[PDB]
């Protein structure tokens, strides 16, 4: 039941985001409602999250492939839908495996950003 509910919620989010893209591509993101922006952000994270590096495409992707368990996928997508990962950067979901890989990539990105901020601040 949980698998079915999560899949249906993801499909509904993607459908609504596709509908909103028609307006976005003409006017702009800033011409949306307050909640529409939240839907857009969540749907963009979903679209990025759906990507995965295959163990056979390591040459083209240049990254170690991932094998995501069925339960892990359901849990990660259910958590993402609830919005508990709104703070995580959008690119953290790009080309990763489960949620743990997303969090590890987000941690690395945060460390890099902190290093850049420290370098900029020290420049003063």
């Amino acid at each position: 039941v949980d698998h079915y509910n999560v899949a249906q919620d993801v499909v509904q989010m993607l459908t609504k985001y596709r509908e909103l893209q028609d307006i976005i591509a003409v006017l702009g993101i800033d011409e949306l409602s307050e909640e529409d922006k939240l839907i857009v952000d969540r749907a963009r994270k979903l679209v990025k999250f759906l990507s995965q590096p295959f163990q056979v495409a390591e040459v083209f992707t240049g990254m170690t492939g991932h094998y995501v368990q069925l339960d892990d996928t359901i849990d990660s997508f259910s958590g993402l839908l609830m919005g508990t990962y709104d703070q995580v950067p959008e690119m953290a979901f790009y080309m990763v495996g489960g949620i743990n890989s997303v969090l590890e990539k987000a941690k690395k990105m945060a460390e890099e950003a902190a290093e850049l901020e420290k370098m900029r601040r020290a420049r003063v």
């Binding site: 958590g79 508990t84 990962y85 703070q87 995580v88 949620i99 743990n100 969090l103 590890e104 987000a106 941690k107 945060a110 460390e111 950003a113 902190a114 901020e117 601040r121």
Partner: peptide, 30 residues
């Protein structure tokens, strides 16, 4: 009061999320 008298995989995700949030807050500070 009576409740007191009477008496891990998900923890890793929570720990990682807390660490990420802490780093993202620290970078904003300085």
């Amino acid at each position: 009061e009576a409740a007191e008298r009477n008496p891990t995989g998900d923890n890793a995700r929570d720990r990682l999320l807390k660490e990420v949030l802490a780093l993202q807050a620290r970078i904003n500070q300085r």
